[PDB]
Task: inverse folding
């Protein structure tokens, strides 16, 4: 994977000694080239993960996330061009360095071989985002935002470290290939429950899970837009990639202690989706929407069925493209109106034709029209959960109905209706943010044509 | 027939021919402990490098 790693780190010298105006052009073009090179990673064998090196390996689960990160990186590059114009060149290059460093840690995380190496770069993503959230934020609270996001993830991260090093002393290795191949049943000894626990809350705190999610509304609604997408699109999914990994050994414990988190989640998305319907800030809805969508994933991983894992993977990638779009969409409105209140700028279809479309299928992908990959992930979860328990259907079915309730609500309360006559600064929609939405949406329908590439290794 | 020994003569180290045997264990020492396994053998490169976590070499 150094055919991706080496060019990615080579973006640092190139972006750090380019001209004072070419930093945006240079970073965007070669990051896209990295995305094209990363597209070759879509190739997967029947069941053998691509073992490029001793310390790097990939399969049908890592690559779709890998392409998601690499494809994403130019998207914040173009999104940040708007509000980063009024800055010095050296600080601007510092911003680009954080994004590239964030990307580089992401690729190493997904391509990691053993759990400890995965853990190091996994957590290492906290540092670049911590600077992004805090240094370049917009409001006073961002200082409290960073601490909330940092400690929450760390509070669960440290128990996993103790459990991980404990794995090495007991099993003899932490390599994922050996762990799955040398998998042994886990006893129900009272120590083993905490052993199971210490490998879980690390992944579910950043999912986020119901209860342990408050950093999500306190960061995504408050981070800079560029940091907002990568947080929602991929960073939450870091728990997903880990959980499919760590569950290979933590069996058959999952049968019992999934329950306290299952209905914690099962009552979760319905509860969270209710909060989304009754927000006042724009970005607060999508943030609360993200945990709601992430909640069905938690059930998908934990239930441990092949169908749910495919549904987990599809919903994971689909939500990333979606949540990035709505966060980008909110940023476009926030920039002109200098706020994020929902009913502040209702009724803008008459002035924003193309935006009103970009609202339209972005919300529809949030409603998950058929046959968008959102349903393909969502429906697979439903069938797996129903096979587990019939009474499941009412809950998340009601959730995706209250999900439908709000997912038109901002469409009504941002585009439908009459403009505000005192507002007179909604200028012609610039092609930059405009083309940004195009690059968000077309891969969604393109992947809809051939979804078979994003169901993970269980397909 | 006695002559006073000169200075330092009485302080010389003398030798005697006692017929008693030399005590093999004057201190009655117990059995000496066996030495620990001797360190020997040839040195070859460490198997699979450091063998610590993700460090292949």
Result:
């Amino acid at each position: 994977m150094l055919k991706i790693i080496i060019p990615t780190t080579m973006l640092l010298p190139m972006t750090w000694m380019s001209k004072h105006n070419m930093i945006w052009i240079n970073a965007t073009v070669h990051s896209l080239l990295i995305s094209l090179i990363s597209l070759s990673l879509l190739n997967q064998l029947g069941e053998n993960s691509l073992n490029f090196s001793l310390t790097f390996f990939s399969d049908s689960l890592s690559a779709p996330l890998l392409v998601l990160t690499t494809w994403l990186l130019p998207l914040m590059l173009m999104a940040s061009q708007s509000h980063l114009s009024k800055e010095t060149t050296t600080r601007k290059k510092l911003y680009i360095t954080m994004l590239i460093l964030l990307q580089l840690f992401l690729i190493m995380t997904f391509t990691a071989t053993e759990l400890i190496l995965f853990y190091i770069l996994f957590e290492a993503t906290l540092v670049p985002t911590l600077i992004i959230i805090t240094r370049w934020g917009n409001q006073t609270e961002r200082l409290n935002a960073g601490l909330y996001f940092l400690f929450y993830t760390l509070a669960g991260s440290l128990p996993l470290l103790v459990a991980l090093v404990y794995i090495q002393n007991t099993t003899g290795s932490l390599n994922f290939l050996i762990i799955h191949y040398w998998s042994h049943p886990l006893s129900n000894s009272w120590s083993n429950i905490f052993m199971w626990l210490a490998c879980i809350m690390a992944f579910m705190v950043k999912m986020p899970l119901y209860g342990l999610h408050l950093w999500l509304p306190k960061a995504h609604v408050e981070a800079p837009i560029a940091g907002s997408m990568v947080l929602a699109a991929v960073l939450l999914k870091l728990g997903g990639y880990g959980m499919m990994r760590i569950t290979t050994i933590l069996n058959p414990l999952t049968n019992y202690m999934a329950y306290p988190f299952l209905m914690l989640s099962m009552w979760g998305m319905i509860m969270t989706s209710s909060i989304c319907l009754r927000q006042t800030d724009l970005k607060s809805l999508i943030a609360y929407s993200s945990v709601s969508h992430m909640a069905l994933v938690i059930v998908a991983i934990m239930i441990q069925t092949p169908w749910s894992f495919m549904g987990a993977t599809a919903l994971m990638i689909a939500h990333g493209l979606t949540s990035s779009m709505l966060f980008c969409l909110a940023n476009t409105n926030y920039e002109r109106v200098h706020s994020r209140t929902m009913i502040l700028a209702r009724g803008l279809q008459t002035l924003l034709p193309l935006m009103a479309t970009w609202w339209l299928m972005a919300s529809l992908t949030n409603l998950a029209l058929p046959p968008s990959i959102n349903l393909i992930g969502e429906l697979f979860i439903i069938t797996a959960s129903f096979s587990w328990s019939n009474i499941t259907i009412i809950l998340m079915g009601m959730n995706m109905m209250i999900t439908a309730l709000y997912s038109l609500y901002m469409l009504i309360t941002t585009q439908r209706g009459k403009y505000t006559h005192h507002i007179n600064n909604i200028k012609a929609s610039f092609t930059r943010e405009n083309a940004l939405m195009a690059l968000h949406i077309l891969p969604l329908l393109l992947l809809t044509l051939n979804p078979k590439m994003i169901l993970g290794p269980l397909y | 027939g006695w002559v006073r020994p000169d200075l330092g003569e009485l302080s010389k180290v003398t030798k005697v021919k006692t017929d008693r045997p030399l005590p093999e264990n004057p201190y009655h020492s117990r059995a000496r402990p066996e030495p620990n396994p001797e360190a020997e053998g040839d040195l070859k490169p460490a198997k699979h490098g450091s063998r610590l976590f993700f460090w292949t070499m």
Remarks:
- The CA atoms of residues 3 and 43 of chain B lie 73 Å apart.
- Chain B touches chain A at residues 53-54, 56 (CB under 8 Å).
- Chain B has no helices and no strands.
- The radius of gyration of chain B is 31 Å.
